[PDB]
Design an enzyme around this catalytic site. Structure first.
Site, PDB file in Angstrom:
ATOM      1  N   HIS A  55       0.858  -1.183   0.000  1.00 54.67           N
ATOM      2  CA  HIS A  55       0.000   0.000   0.000  1.00 54.67           C
ATOM      3  C   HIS A  55       0.898   1.239   0.000  1.00 54.67           C
ATOM      4  O   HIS A  55       2.038   1.178   0.465  1.00 54.67           O
ATOM      5  CB  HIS A  55      -0.908   0.012   1.232  1.00 54.67           C
ATOM      6  CG  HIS A  55      -2.005  -1.010   1.188  1.00 54.67           C
ATOM      7  ND1 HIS A  55      -3.071  -0.992   2.060  1.00 54.67           N
ATOM      8  CD2 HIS A  55      -2.213  -2.066   0.367  1.00 54.67           C
ATOM      9  CE1 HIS A  55      -3.891  -1.987   1.778  1.00 54.67           C
ATOM     10  NE2 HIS A  55      -3.394  -2.656   0.753  1.00 54.67           N
ATOM     11  N   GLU A  57       1.141   3.963   1.812  1.00 57.34           N
ATOM     12  CA  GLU A  57       1.704   4.294   3.123  1.00 57.34           C
ATOM     13  C   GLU A  57       2.900   3.423   3.487  1.00 57.34           C
ATOM     14  O   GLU A  57       3.922   3.915   3.965  1.00 57.34           O
ATOM     15  CB  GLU A  57       0.655   4.124   4.227  1.00 57.34           C
ATOM     16  CG  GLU A  57      -0.602   4.940   4.034  1.00 57.34           C
ATOM     17  CD  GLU A  57      -1.689   4.177   3.301  1.00 57.34           C
ATOM     18  OE1 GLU A  57      -2.815   4.132   3.841  1.00 57.34           O
ATOM     19  OE2 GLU A  57      -1.444   3.638   2.190  1.00 57.34           O
ATOM     20  N   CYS A  85      -5.822   2.082   5.892  1.00 60.82           N
ATOM     21  CA  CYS A  85      -6.474   0.846   6.294  1.00 60.82           C
ATOM     22  C   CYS A  85      -5.920   0.430   7.662  1.00 60.82           C
ATOM     23  O   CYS A  85      -5.021   1.073   8.198  1.00 60.82           O
ATOM     24  CB  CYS A  85      -6.204  -0.250   5.259  1.00 60.82           C
ATOM     25  SG  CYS A  85      -4.558  -1.034   5.340  1.00 60.82           S
ATOM     26  N   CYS A  88      -2.038  -0.334   7.616  1.00 63.03           N
ATOM     27  CA  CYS A  88      -1.263   0.904   7.517  1.00 63.03           C
ATOM     28  C   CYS A  88      -1.394   1.790   8.746  1.00 63.03           C
ATOM     29  O   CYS A  88      -0.449   2.462   9.134  1.00 63.03           O
ATOM     30  CB  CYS A  88      -1.679   1.692   6.277  1.00 63.03           C
ATOM     31  SG  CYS A  88      -1.123   0.882   4.750  1.00 63.03           S
TER      32      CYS A  88
HETATM   33 ZN   LIG Z   1      -3.083   0.148   3.911  1.00 66.02          ZN
END
Ligand SMILES: [Zn+2]
Ligand SMILES: [Zn+2]
Lengths: 154, 157
Positions: A55, A57, A85, A88
């Site tokens: 992801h 991040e 999320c 993260c």
């Molecule tokens: Zn994430």
């Protein structure tokens, strides 16, 4: 110099989300800032890296840690185009980021204000501050992505 | 039935393989946690917490093992795979199991402070997730002692 506040940095993150969209990825971009300087930039790269954990991040954190040659990102701020999320959100705690600013909410996976309030959990030793700063373009990028998804599935 | 076949190794066996990775971490000066991913009885990947070595706060054993398995199987989803780890996955790793579609996680010790399966949050039992990750606490005191010893050698310095 010109105004480099939250909208400015989120706009920079949006360029990374745009890049992701162009690469066929979920369109989320993130940048790490320290004392007004951009330390790292990244975008969701799950599809290209065949890695469900890639992801924006996560990639931004890894690059910032690499550039600062440090495990912790104390004093750094993370600007991301979509509410981080659960995975993260905790990564932010682990890296000791000072604050995260996001421009859209994620109702099904968000770990800041949606599904879980990971950043405000009492047991936490370090407390990551956060700010939701909505930007219409961030949500529209996501909505356009889902329209593309539907069209690409019979 | 044309070729040889056998039962898959037991949970204790795989947790012991993970404990070996954890001891390597211990010797390398990191939090002693090891993890392996198994698919159809075969070990796909093995890893240990490498946060200090890599100067990466996200380099937990589970994260490294998942990335390696995805790469060896050339897929972002680890359907049919089980993950054995010496300590209950933290919140970050717990959700990584969800995102990777791991079938089940088996752990040998609890993490009262960062535990994301039964301790702090029940990340896996969140009905919001499309994929439900099965889990099992298969206690092995040796795993808890390795962590305690680490934290002890911590203050004693
Ligand atoms: Zn994430
Ligand atoms: Zn973890």
């Amino acid at each position: 110099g010109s105004h480099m506040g939250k909208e400015y940095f989120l706009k920079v993150a949006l360029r990374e989300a745009k890049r992701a969209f162009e690469k066929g990825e979920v369109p989320v971009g993130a940048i790490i800032v320290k004392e007004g300087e951009i330390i790292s930039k990244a975008h969701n790269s799950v599809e290209e890296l065949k890695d469900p954990t890639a992801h924006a991040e996560m990639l931004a954190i890894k690059e910032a840690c690499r550039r600062l040659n440090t495990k912790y990102l104390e004093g750094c701020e993370l600007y991301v185009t979509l509410e981080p999320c659960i995975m993260c959100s905790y990564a932010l705690v682990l890296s000791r980021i000072e604050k995260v600013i996001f421009s859209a909410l994620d109702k099904k996976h968000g770990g800041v204000v949606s599904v879980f309030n990971i950043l405000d959990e009492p047991t936490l030793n370090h407390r990551v501050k956060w700010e939701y700063y909505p930007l219409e373009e961030a949500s529209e990028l996501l909505s356009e992505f889902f329209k593309k998804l539907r069209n690409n599935i019979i």
